[PDB]
């Protein structure tokens, strides 16, 4: 979402996404980038 904050949190969020409930992984990636 942000310039700085986005890049900071996002890598961690991806690692989380690997084993989330329902299909939250999708939401994580949507906001973030790679």
């Amino acid at each position: 979402w942000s310039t700085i904050v986005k890049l900071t949190i996002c890598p961690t969020l991806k690692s989380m996404a690997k084993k989330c409930e329902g299909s939250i992984a999708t939401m994580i990636k949507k906001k973030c980038d790679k």
Binding site: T8, I9, L13, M16, A17, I24, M27
Partner: protein, 37 residues
């Protein structure tokens, strides 16, 4: 690489919905960061 206290505070609301609706080591980590504040 590492994320500071300030960032953890900022992300809190955004990360919240995903966090509880998730599991594993990383989910537990982020939860701890925002919560313990």
């Amino acid at each position: 690489g590492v994320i500071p206290k300030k960032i953890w505070e900022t992300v809190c609301p955004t990360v919240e919905p995903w966090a509880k609706k998730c599991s594993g080591d990383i989910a537990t980590y982020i939860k701890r960061e925002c919560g313990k504040l």
